[PDB]
Design a protein around this ligand. Structure first.
Ligand code: U5P
Lengths: 1629, 182
RNA sequence: GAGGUAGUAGGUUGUAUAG
RNA sequence: CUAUACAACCUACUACCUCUCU
């Protein structure tokens, strides 16, 4: 909007507040709410003086002692201060425990306080302040007459307390102007004060540019022939209606005559428009028949007038047509707006409908006139339609035909024209209209639409009271002649440049210094309530008999410039102003502030962010799914572990042997045990399996798998005596591997070669046996058996063999009992469940089509069972799928799945229709025994989970190598990991009153017995009469309107600096033409050297707020710049000799939730992302100490965003270390000594399919051939799943975060910071030092020495410099005085501070300009945001309920909100010590705290602002965002004072957050809208709002069908909707 | 017959021996259509028939693989009041123009009889209401009501009741006069 | 063991809405 | 980033059909 403003328009209430702080004061302001805020803040400011002087403060008011409830101002001083404030009851009898010696502020009657001074129960010298409520009352003047005339005047001015009177405005005194001035002068001499006025009215009359007021009369009206007929018909109707008998038409009469006699016939029928529209309803709405006759005869009279005026210019015969009958009038106003052809023309009235019809008139004259085209012009539904229409009208005109509402509070851009069509009867409304024209030049129009001499006397009164207002007030405005001579002087002066070689740089001079200062003041971080301005003191001094002015400028508290820019003296005010602002601009550019994304970091790799080359062009190709998002997936290789590559046993090499030791720890439940089998412990297997490898496997955790026998723990154990293989032992073990993973498990599939001499995924698995003596070793005779029994086809034995052989049970006990008559090519392998002796081939068949089993096998197959006396076999199906990692009967939450029914257990336990019965001579015993088959089907999940643990140990190896985080190769035997377990347990009316005080009363006069016509009054009246009549202020009725729009350089130095000579600077300058700012400082230093004594005078209300920096000393410094046990958050274990995080947990963070496994990254991912934010915040704060928080948040959002975490993930290549699909042994798992080619998937998509033609065979090998041969054999005729798996980019970022969380959980926040350095985003300072003697030792953090032996050791967090801004002589003493009364804030919070600058920095708003000693809360808010974020995330991660992803993020996102923080702030009184000089913030916080104490300080986020049964509907409750920021900022301040310790912050905030933690944690209460949505998913709706007429408030209604419509109110839409849903829930409870 | 051809062909072969084995070969990883492709490996020892099938569903992929295996083998109201009165004015006829071309100052034309002729002419009636009380001036007044769509009252006053009704009909004649002229 | 219908439990990807 | 609804897909279960085994 570019408010290129004049000097600094400060907050006008605060301006009056500072004037009250200086001298005794009568405040000229009308609104009593603003006057309460000023009174409250002045009490707060003098509270410190009252305490350290042992004094008291008295507030005298009028309504006190009448009504039983306490007054409003008492409620504020007990709610929003820390002050001991006392209220006197109507006819108060003194209780014995009550005293004024121990009350801070005493609100008392004037009669009561008069009695106190009479009886010495309160002493006047002990009184610091006396405040008089509405002291312009005559009655209270008489009441304080004994008070002042007996006690205040006889007291010396040394002992006189400071006096404030909250009077009404001086255009509201209820006197004539003569007697007004007399009442004034008697009033200032009476109460020993002065009028301080400084309203918005005064602000525009002096601080804003002058609008020239032009006054155009309006002539009375006569009638032409048409209007003679109109007047004739109307007086006939009036003279009839006087005699019409009925033993509101006069309103239509009395308005229709005026619109006839003031505008003419066209507007007469366009008022007949409105009045016949009224009568068309009001003749039907009446019940009385004669009143109906009267209303309808008035309606027919309007029909007459409309018929005549329609028969007048559309029938008898159009700008000449409208100008003919209707009087011109508005021509001069139109020419006033035509000469301005940036114009923001505003027209003001007092009726809404007049504003609408004038908007329509300006609209139609915009479309009609070609020169005027540039003018851009219960049941709450119609209220919103009207509100939306009016704001649409306001947007169309402003980018304003206003009314009385657009007078105070509304902010608009600067204007050229303000219109008063309505003749102003009131000065207050007149100058609130006039207050907007500011564009310099800008104009004001008065339209008066003898008596002219009397209105001339009235504007003489208005100008004269304007002169009294400006004259008796605060610091003035310099006249425009000084700006004229500044415009003269600045014409030839050349601007300062930031770079002197660059001529075309930033041009800044005296003529644009103030604009740059004000734009910088506006661009600081601020919310709506904050108004950042700079405080400008001027000072008179005399040099060579010539008057000069020093101009101490002070920039806001948010800006990092914390000392006073002192200007150097110039002849007048305005040149001192421009020089002070230009010295401030150069002083800014010395520290580089001239003006988020503009800021960049101060350390290199932070601003580098090196993109990978093809990933870079992936970033600039925005059509692709973006990197760091879930929508882009990359296919990574599954890394076979380091210990499993190139470890193949070769002949001669001694080899490591590990027994895969299984141990059943939990037998299967009998509810799970459907078929009721014997439980087989896998440690009872005489034959197990073993792994032969030449590279030693490190120490690994024992993990659990879940087969039919139940939960079986898996571990690996080294054999002591090594194995050396011969060639034939290599051949038989290769045949064994091909047999076991081709035929016993059939894991071998197509495109799959057993290659024993591989380099990758090359290891041996051997059939081990328990030694009969003891121990385990390689079963050599079993290997001989597998050599003999290779891929031998099952043979159909003849009848003679079965006749020959009897049945041996031990051949068929504990063995795989495969039938030979069925399934010849792919035989079905069967366990032994039971051997039934009672059954036989002649035993009874269950089915009906066959009799006994011998007849069955004779019929269906043709085979004769030779021995019918043999016992039979109940058998089971063998394990089809071989994934056993997830337990078969548990959900992910640990909730058991439904087991089988008892009927379907027992009925199918003994029936022969189920189960499976076999004949032993009709079966072949497979060579593998059955317990060996159990561990043999256990194997593939063992191999996949060991490969997972070893990839996690490889990540731990890589960090401990590249950064010294633990032992490199953990090969010590006396060390074990934690077990891999999955977690699965198997006030408006007061504003109306102050409006009433403005409108109707405005009364009261003391005396008249003196001589008020002191001639000088009549002289000033006649002078203003002559100046208005002759000066063009009075435009007469015949006059139309007025829309009007050298010196030698050394002599210029004498004129401009009168304290130098003519020949001194002749030789001093020489070649130099103009003295630049440094030269001017040198010249003033030379003059203060040549004139060593300097004097200074306080001019204006350059305030006594600040002191010290600009005052107090007053000694020549005046011319230039002279670990809780119940779980911790900062749990820091040792880093020297610590093995680090277990590969169990690193594996947990590696494998996603997509893999369906019982271990997940997600909880560790949440704690990791939260620590990433926390540590980047704390280091970002301590690094860039002067930089405000917006740029630091932009740096952290450049840090933590998952594109950068994805870049660090691909740089460390974590895609090739994770698990992306559930382990399924037939499809996604390459067994030892095989390979899958990658390119045939391009040959698999169509291409090579007329028919087969190849059946492998022709492509014998692809890996051995080169890629040219690969592409050839592909072309002779979208990812691998066996060894590759697809992972999305955001999941890689999730793994980086979860890995940070894993390192956090085991090796502390310091380990997480070092691991954060490991990833690539820096968080710790590098100290790049030369070589530390013993390179083999790495102290934790120290990377590898380079080619020139340099370690780059990572150092700790520096301690940040405290923002106690020593630019004052006694900044510590001013800190101690300004921070008074914070001790009970500390006791209400808990933690005593060491450096109280952090306290004040936390509890200073950005507005509190009396504070020089710190900065605002926004830096500490930015810090305490992430400190509380991590504190909440880790206190909810450790919750033994074990929250899911969604549960943990819901619990935090409702535990971290500004409503929560504001509520917990207000409960412990964090509003009471929030030093703010912001008015709207004070009212918002005040009404919030009052209706929180109305809730009795219970933590309600929800039940203070609705009930439908409470009449709270006007002025609902306002939740302050600022006190939420105060709770965050005091969190940051506590964190910084603890030497950056989190356990102290949680030690404090347990007592402030733990009840709400347990309350929202224990029950899941859902979202309050969503809970009503879950109760009724098609019923509860939320309609559009409405805004009430109060000015801040919104009403939204919920409806529940057959349950009622529940009303709602909130300042925002969201709280109204939510609390409407909540009160619906309370009614449905 | 009409079921999954994997089951049909499994039973059809298992009547004549030999055990087929289906296998997953490629799960497709598309953005919103992650299809599956399976392959049947019938008798990889002797005469290997390995047939591929594409499909969004695993049942559909196995079905397509089985079919491939088989197939390779073989105001405005004051405005609105004004227009329909003009329609009543065209429905009136000639007496509107006689009303225009006469002077209403003279009482020799009988206002009540002329307005009754207008009522007879234009299919309406005229209502004359003389309320019984006396004014502060001690005279009489009447209202004439136009029995049409709108409410309709023209006023009149006089020293007697008959002169009051005559003046009311005179003002009604002024009314119907002053809409008439074009 | 295979094919099929329901529930029950875990999740992956979209579409829409609100903060 | 949080909440809700719908569609697909996957596998852990349970009860039951269509066959087979028995
Ligand atoms: O057919 C499968 C399953 O029904 C059957 N089985 C095995 C073992 C047991 O205790 N109960 C049982 O029903 O045998 C086959 C094995 O498959 P699963 O390993 O159970 O998936």
């Amino acid at each position: 909007n570019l408010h290129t403003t004049v000097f600094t328009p400060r907050d006008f209430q605060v301006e009056l507040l500072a004037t009250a702080y200086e001298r005794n004061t009568i405040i000229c302001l009308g609104h009593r709410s603003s006057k309460e805020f000023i009174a409250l803040k002045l009490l707060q400011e003098l509270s410190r003086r009252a305490r350290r002087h042992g004094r008291v403060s008295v507030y005298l008011s009028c309504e006190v002692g009448t009504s039983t409830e306490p007054c409003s101002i008492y409620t504020m001083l007990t709610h929003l201060t820390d002050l001991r404030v006392w209220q006197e009851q109507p006819d108060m009898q003194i209780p014995f425990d009550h005293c004024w010696t121990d009350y801070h502020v005493s609100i008392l009657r004037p009669e009561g306080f008069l009695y106190l001074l009479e009886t010495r129960e309160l002493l006047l010298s002990r009184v610091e302040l006396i405040v008089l409520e509405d002291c312009h009352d005559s009655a209270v003047y008489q009441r304080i007459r004994p008070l002042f005339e007996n006690h205040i005047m006889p007291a010396p001015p040394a002992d006189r307390p400071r006096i404030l009177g909250l009077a009404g405005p001086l255009h509201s005194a209820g006197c004539e102007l003569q007697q007004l001035s007399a009442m004034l002068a008697t009033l200032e001499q009476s109460v020993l004060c002065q009028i301080e006025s400084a309203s918005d009215i005064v602000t525009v009359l002096r601080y804003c540019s002058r609008p020239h007021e032009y006054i155009v009369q309006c002539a009375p009206f006569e009638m032409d022939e048409l209007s003679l007929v109109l007047a004739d018909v109307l007086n006939t109707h009036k003279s009839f209606l006087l005699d019409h008998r009925y033993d509101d038409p006069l309103n239509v009469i009395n308005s229709l005559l005026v619109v006839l006699h003031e505008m003419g016939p066209w507007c007469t029928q366009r008022a007949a428009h409105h009045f016949y529209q009224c009568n068309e309803k009001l003749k039907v709405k009446t019940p009385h028949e004669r009143h109906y006759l009267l209303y309808c005869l008035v309606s027919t009279a309007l029909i007459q007038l409309y018929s005549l005026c329609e028969h007048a210019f559309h029938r008898h015969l159009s700008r000449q047509t409208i100008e003919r009958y209707s009087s011109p009038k508005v021509r001069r106003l139109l020419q006033t707006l035509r000469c301005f052809k940036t114009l923001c023309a505003l027209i003001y009235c007092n009726q809404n409908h007049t504003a609408r019809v004038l908007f329509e008139l300006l609209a139609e004259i915009s479309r009609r006139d070609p020169d005027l085209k540039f003018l851009r012009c219960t049941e709450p539904k119609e209220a919103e339609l009207e509100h939306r229409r009016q704001e649409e009208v306001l947007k169309r005109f402003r980018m304003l035909i206003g009314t009385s509402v657009l007078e105070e509070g509304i902010d608009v851009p600067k204007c050229n024209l303000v219109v008063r069509w309505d003749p102003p009867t009131t000065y207050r409304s007149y100058v609130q209209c006039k207050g907007r024209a500011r564009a310099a030049p800008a104009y004001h129009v008065i339209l008066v639409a003898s008596t002219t001499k009397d209105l001339v006397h009235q504007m003489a009164q208005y100008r004269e009271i304007e002169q009294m207002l400006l004259s008796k007030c605060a610091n003035t405005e310099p006249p425009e002649q000084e700006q004229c001579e500044a415009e003269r002087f600045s014409a030839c002066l050349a601007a300062y440049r930031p770079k002197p070689h660059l001529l075309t740089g930033a041009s800044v001079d005296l003529g644009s210094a103030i604009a740059l200062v004000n734009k910088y003041c506006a661009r600081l971080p601020s919310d709506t309530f904050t108004k950042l301005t700079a405080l400008w003191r001027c000072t008179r001094n005399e040099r060579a008999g010539v008057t000069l002015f020093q101009y101490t400028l002070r920039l806001p508290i948010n800006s990092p410039l914390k000392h006073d820019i002192v200007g150097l003296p110039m002849p007048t005010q305005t040149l001192a102003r421009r020089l002070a602002a230009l010295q401030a601009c150069v002083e800014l550019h010395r520290i580089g502030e001239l003006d988020k994304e503009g800021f960049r970091a101060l350390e290199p790799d932070w601003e580098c962010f090196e993109l990978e080359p093809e990933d870079e062009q992936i970033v600039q190709l925005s059509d692709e799914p973006r990197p760091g998002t879930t929508k882009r997936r990359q296919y990574y290789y599954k890394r076979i572990a380091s210990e499993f590559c190139d470890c193949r046993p070769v002949a001669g090499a001694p080899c490591y042997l590990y027994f895969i030791q299984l141990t059943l720890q939990c037998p299967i439940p009998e509810e799970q045990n459907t078929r009721g089998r014997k439980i087989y412990p896998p440690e009872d297997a005489q034959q197990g399996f073993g792994i032969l490898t030449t590279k030693r496997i490190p120490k690994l955790s024992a993990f659990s798998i879940f087969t039919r026998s139940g939960e079986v723990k898996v571990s690996l154990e080294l054999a002591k005596e090594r194995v050396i293989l011969t060639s034939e032992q290599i051949v038989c073990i290769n045949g064994f591997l091909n047999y076991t993973f081709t035929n016993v498990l059939r894991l071998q599939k197509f495109l799959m070669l057993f290659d024993p001499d591989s380099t990758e995924n090359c290891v041996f698995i051997v059939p081990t046996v328990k030694a009969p003596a003891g121990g385990k070793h390689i079963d050599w005779q079993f290997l001989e058996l597998i050599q003999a029994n290779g891929n031998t086809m099952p043979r159909a034995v003849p009848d003679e063999e079965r006749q020959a052989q009897p049945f041996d049970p031990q051949r068929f006990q504990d063995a795989v009992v495969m039938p030979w008559y069925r399934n010849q090519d792919q035989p079905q392998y069967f366990y032994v469940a039971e051997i039934c002796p009672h059954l036989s081939p002649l035993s009874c068949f269950p089915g009906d089509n066959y009799r006994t089993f011998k007849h069955y096998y004779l019929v269906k197959y043709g085979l004769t069972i030779q021995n019918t006396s043999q016992p039979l076999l109940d058998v089971d199906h063998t394990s089809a799928r071989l994934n056993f990692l997830t337990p078969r009967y548990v959900n992910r939450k640990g909730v058991a799945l439904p087991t089988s029914s008892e009927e379907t257990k027992r009925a199918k336990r003994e029936n022969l229709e189920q189960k499976q019965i076999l004949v032993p001579e009709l079966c072949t015993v497979h060579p593998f025994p059955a317990s060996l088959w159990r561990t043999a089907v256990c194997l593939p999940c063992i191999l996949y989970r060991i490969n997972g643990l070893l990839l996690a140990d490889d990540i731990r190896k890589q960090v401990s190598a590249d950064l010294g985080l633990g032992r490199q190769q953990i090969e010590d035997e006396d060390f074990e990991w934690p077990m891999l377990d999955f977690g699965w347990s198997l006030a408006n009316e007061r504003q109306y009153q102050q409006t009433k005080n403005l409108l109707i009363g405005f009364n009261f006069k003391h005396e008249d017995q003196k001589e008020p016509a002191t001639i000088r009054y009549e002289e000033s009246i006649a002078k203003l009469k002559t100046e208005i009549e002759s000066g063009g202020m009075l435009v007469p009725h015949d006059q139309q309107l007025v829309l009007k729009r050298k010196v030698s350089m050394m002599e210029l130095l004498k004129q401009l600096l009168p304290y130098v000579n003519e020949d001194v600077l002749a030789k001093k300058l020489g070649d130099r033409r103009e003295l630049l700012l440094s030269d001017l400082v040198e010249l003033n230093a030379d003059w203060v050297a040549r004139h060593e004594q300097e004097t200074y005078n306080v001019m204006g209300c350059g305030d006594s707020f600040d002191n010290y920096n600009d005052h107090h000393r007053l000694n020549l410094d005046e011319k230039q710049l002279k670990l809780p046990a119940g779980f911790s958050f900062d749990r820091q274990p040792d880093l020297v000799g610590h093995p680090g995080p277990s590969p169990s947990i690193i594996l947990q963070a590696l494998t996603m939730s997509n893999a369906n496994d019982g271990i997940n990254l997600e909880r560790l991912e949440t704690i990791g992302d939260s620590f990433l934010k926390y540590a980047i915040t704390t280091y970002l704060y301590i690094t860039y100490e002067n930089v405000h928080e917006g740029k630091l948040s932009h740096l952290r959002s450049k840090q933590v965003a998952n594109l950068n975490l994805y870049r660090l993930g691909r740089r460390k290549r974590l895609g090739e270390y994770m698990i992306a699909t559930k382990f399924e042994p037939h499809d996604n798992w390459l067994p030892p000594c095989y390979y899958v080619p990658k390119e045939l998937e391009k040959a698999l998509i169509e291409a090579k399919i007329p028919t087969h033609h190849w059946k492998l065979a022709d492509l014998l090998d692809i890996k051995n051939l080169s890629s040219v041969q690969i592409c050839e054999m592909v072309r002779e005729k979208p990812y691998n799943l066996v060894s590759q798996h697809s992972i999305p980019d955001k999941s890689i970022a999730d793994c980086v975060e979860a890995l940070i969380g894993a390192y956090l959980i085991e090796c502390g926040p310091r380990g997480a910071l070092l691991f954060m350095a490991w990833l690539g985003v820096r968080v710790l300072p590098i100290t790049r030092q030369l070589d530390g003697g013993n390179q083999e030792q790495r102290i934790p953090g120290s990377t590898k020495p380079n080619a020139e032996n340099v370690v780059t050791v990572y150092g700790a967090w520096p301690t940040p410099r405290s923002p106690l801004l020593h630019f004052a002589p006694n900044a510590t003493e001013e800190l101690d005085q300004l921070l008074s009364g914070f001790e009970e804030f500390e006791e209400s919070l808990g933690y005593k501070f060491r450096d109280r600058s952090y306290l004040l920095q936390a509890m200073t708003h950005a507005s509190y300009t009396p504070n020089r000693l710190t900065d605002c809360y926004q830096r500490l808010e930015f810090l305490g945001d992430a400190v509380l974020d991590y504190l909440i995330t880790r206190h909810l991660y450790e919750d033994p309920r074990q929250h899911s992803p969604g549960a943990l993020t819901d619990l935090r996102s409702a535990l971290v909100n500004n409503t929560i923080f504001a509520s917990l702030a207000v409960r412990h009184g964090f509003h009471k010590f929030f030093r703010h000089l912001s008015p709207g913030l004070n009212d918002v916080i005040d009404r919030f705290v009052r209706i929180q104490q109305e809730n009795g300080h219970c933590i309600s986020e929800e039940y203070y602002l609705l009930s439908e049964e409470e009449c709270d509907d006007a002025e609902d409750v306002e939740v302050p965002k600022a006190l939420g920021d105060v709770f965050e900022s005091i969190a940051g301040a506590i964190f910084l004072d603890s030497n950056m310790s989190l356990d102290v912050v949680w030690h404090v905030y347990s007592n402030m957050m733990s009840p709400e933690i347990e309350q929202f944690s224990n029950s899941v209460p859902k979202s309050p809208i969503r809970e009503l949505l879950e109760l009724e998913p098609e019923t509860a709706k939320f309609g559009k709002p409405e805004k009430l007429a109060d000015g801040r408030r919104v009403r939204v209604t919920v409806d529940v069908f057959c349950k009622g419509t529940f009303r709602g109110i909130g300042r925002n839409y969201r709280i109204a909707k939510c609390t409407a849903a909540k009160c619906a829930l309370r009614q449905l409870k | 017959a009409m079921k999954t051809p994997v089951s049909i062909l499994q039973e059809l072969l298992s009547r004549r021996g030999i055990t087929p084995g289906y296998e997953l070969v490629q799960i497709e990883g598309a953005i919103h259509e992650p299809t599956f492709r399976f392959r049947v490996s019938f008798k990889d020892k002797d005469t290997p028939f390995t047939a591929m099938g594409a499909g969004r569903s695993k049942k559909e992929a196995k079905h397509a693989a089985a079919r491939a295996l088989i197939d390779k083998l073989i105001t405005q109201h004051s405005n609105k009041v004004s227009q329909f009165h003009k329609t009543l004015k065209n429905a009136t006829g000639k007496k509107l123009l006689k009303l225009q071309k006469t002077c209403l100052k003279n009482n020799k034309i009988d206002y009540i009889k002329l307005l009754g002729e207008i009522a007879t002419e234009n299919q309406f009636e005229v209502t004359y209401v003389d309320i019984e009380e006396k004014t502060f001036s001690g005279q009489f007044q009447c209202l004439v009501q136009l029995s049409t769509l709108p409410v309709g009252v023209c006023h009149g006053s006089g020293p007697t009741a008959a002169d009051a009704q005559r003046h009311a009909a005179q003002n009604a004649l002024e009314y119907l006069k002053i809409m008439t002229k074009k």
